[PDB]
Design goal:
Chain C: Belongs to the Toll-like receptor family. The complex is a heterotrimer, with two copies of chain A and one copy of chain C (440 residues). With 66 residues, chain A is mostly beta strands. Chain A is built from no helices and four strands. The radius of gyration of chain C is 29 Å and the shape is elongated. Classes of the chains: A mainly beta (66), C mainly beta (440). The structure holds a molecule of 8 linked components (NAG-NAG-BMA-MAN-MAN-BMA-MAN-BMA) and 2-acetamido-2-deoxy-beta-D-glucopyranose (NAG) (4 copies). One 2-acetamido-2-deoxy-beta-D-glucopyranose binds next to loops of chain C.
Amino acid sequence: RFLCRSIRKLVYPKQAIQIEECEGADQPCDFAANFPQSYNPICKQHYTQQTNSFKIPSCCKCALKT
Amino acid sequence: GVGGSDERFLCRSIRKLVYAIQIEECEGADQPCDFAANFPQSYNPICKQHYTQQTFKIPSCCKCALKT
Amino acid sequence: SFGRDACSEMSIDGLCQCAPIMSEYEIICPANAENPTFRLTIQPKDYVQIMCNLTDTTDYQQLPKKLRIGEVDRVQMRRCMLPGHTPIASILDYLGIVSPTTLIFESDNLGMNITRQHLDRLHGLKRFRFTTRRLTHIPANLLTDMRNLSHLELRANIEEMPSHLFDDLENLESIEFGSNKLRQMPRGIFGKMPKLKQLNLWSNQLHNLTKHDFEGATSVLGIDIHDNGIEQLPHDVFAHLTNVTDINLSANLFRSLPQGLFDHNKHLNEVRLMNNRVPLATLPSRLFANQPELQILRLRAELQSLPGDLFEHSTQITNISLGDNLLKTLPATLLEHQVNLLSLDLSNNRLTHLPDSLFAHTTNLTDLRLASNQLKSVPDGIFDRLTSLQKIWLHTNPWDCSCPRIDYLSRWLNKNSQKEQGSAKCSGSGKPVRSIICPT
Ligand SMILES: *[C@@H]1O[C@H](CO)[C@@H](O[C@@H]2O[C@H](CO)[C@@H](O[C@@H]3O[C@H](CO[C@@H]4O[C@H](CO[C@@H]5O[C@H](CO)[C@@H](O)[C@H](O)[C@@H]5O)[C@@H](O)[C@H](O[C@H]5O[C@H](CO)[C@@H](O)[C@H](O)[C@@H]5O)[C@@H]4O)[C@@H](O)[C@H](O[C@H]4O[C@H](CO)[C@@H](O)[C@H](O)[C@@H]4O[C@H]4O[C@H](CO)[C@@H](O)[C@H](O)[C@@H]4O)[C@@H]3O)[C@H](O)[C@H]2NC(C)=O)[C@H](O)[C@H]1NC(C)=O
Ligand SMILES: *[C@@H]1O[C@H](CO)[C@@H](O)[C@H](O)[C@H]1NC(C)=O
Ligand SMILES: *[C@@H]1O[C@H](CO)[C@@H](O)[C@H](O)[C@H]1NC(C)=O
Ligand SMILES: *[C@@H]1O[C@H](CO)[C@@H](O)[C@H](O)[C@H]1NC(C)=O
Ligand SMILES: *[C@@H]1O[C@H](CO)[C@@H](O)[C@H](O)[C@H]1NC(C)=O
């Protein structure tokens, strides 16, 4: 179990790449009340660069916003 | 694995270029997540290495897995 | 001073390679190696990250030569050795870094203990983070002249924090001492910080907190003491936190709570007491009562009963998380004054019956979770005053689908079919409750 709901999908740089995308990006993480005070847990889409360069999604991570 | 000036993470990654494709690896594995002290006893928050598949595996993320 | 033009002028030289990665710039020293001593990441005007791979302090002699980074808000140093008996400001000076307001130093390869000198010249800093997995010693003079600090974070296996470390920290608003080994609060520390609002003391060893441990902390709004191995707490432990708004008492070892624990704390807005590591059978009388600002209550677990007095005259309560406890029933007057309640979670609790007057005044309730319990029935007209109801969870309950017992519920669920999340089913047969038709 992960804090952010994600989906595995294929992306196509213009060969295919299997990636992890947020089901709910910029939305709160699950277990949002389980974090220390003054941290706002938000699901964030992260990216990786491959080189023509391509911004390709990597994973959905729970970011603790201050 | 630098991050934004107003954000913290449960798991920290180290960025590296391999030959160019950017990889994100766990700062050692398999370590407990940070800011994970208020989860139920049954859960073991552990930092887990994520991979993206190319049409081979590429380490692309370090994520917190609440292991039961 | 650094940008698109500065990135191009490097590259081909063969000293340090600058490659643009999205909005940032990656600099590897020495150029082309799977063991670089310095891996820099820069996003102009915003931040710079220095990642060292050092064997000794003499390896700083192979830092990128010249380089003009200029105006930057944040400075992050990962895995770097403290530079002997020289300031950190000198490394920053050599890379041409001006006006940094945030300094983060994270390393398990310190080589020595941190000193007042390591922080020379950068006394105008507003944010400081020092993090290590090493057993360290923090000197009382470390933060001398840090009169501009607003946020302090120290995570270095600290057992005792020196009292004189908090002098000249007159503008501090935030403290993050999570994951240390603090056994006791440093004395008279809050008289020195009149602008302190956040106080994070989670994952420490503060087993014995008393009234005197927070003397002078009258401006504090949030106290997070979760995971501190606390078994007991005196009734006056928070008497001095007169402005406190959020209290986190989670992941502790309470078998009970004293009666007037939140007296003098009349500006409370949220209280968390989640994942208690031992059963906490009940709460004392009027624990969360006569609170004019209290809105959110997160309570878990092994709670077996609640007093009817629990939320008396706390009319502003909007969210109550009572899920995953062991409650068999609720007192009829428990939600008598919760006129502004929006959400109530009672799922996964072992509830066998509910009083008919429980939802008599919760006319603003929109979400009600009663799933995964031991309810066979609900009394007639129990949900009739829930005018604002939008969503209800009644599934995973052993509903007795006998007539006239199931009449009100099956009829109510047909009249409010859209509001039901999941499907409440009859025990044994497995037929949906709303598909049972009682006569007349
Ligand atoms: C305390 O507990 C309460 C529990 O209730 C918590 O508050 C809730 O928080 C939820 C967070 O998930 C909120 O849910 C969102 O609601 C969005 C709709 O807005 C709301 O609409 C209702 C409508 O009410 C009734 O509906 C009928 C029609 O059926 C209307 O005729 C009529 O209005 C009627 O009354 C309304 O009650 C809400 O009003 C409240 O909030 C507003 C502020 O917004 C405030 O001014 C007001 O006073 C009320 O307090 C509000 O208007 C809904 O759009 C969201 O879902 C969509 O987005 C998510 C992502 O965010 C997706 O994952 C979903 O799949 C949905 O996506 C669809 O829709 C979007 C937008 O149209 C599209 O872009 C997509 O393509 C897709 O089609 C979401 O469910 C909920 O509103 C809120 N409840 C209340 C009463 O406030 C509160 O968080 C708790 N606090 C704490 C600290 O825990
Ligand atoms: C640091 O350098 C050494 C060189 O011996 C290498 O073994 C190690 O993997 C490097 N560490 C990182 C994180 O690059
Ligand atoms: C800091 O000081 C303590 C006490 O003298 C010592 O045991 C520890 O090893 C020092 N830390 C480092 C990183 O050298
Ligand atoms: C809250 O703090 C301010 C000073 O920061 C003070 O003036 C005020 O009286 C305090 N409130 C209470 C209830 O003590
Ligand atoms: C909701 O709360 C208000 C203010 O407390 C109250 O006056 C009213 O009775 C409630 N609203 C409804 C629709 O019952």
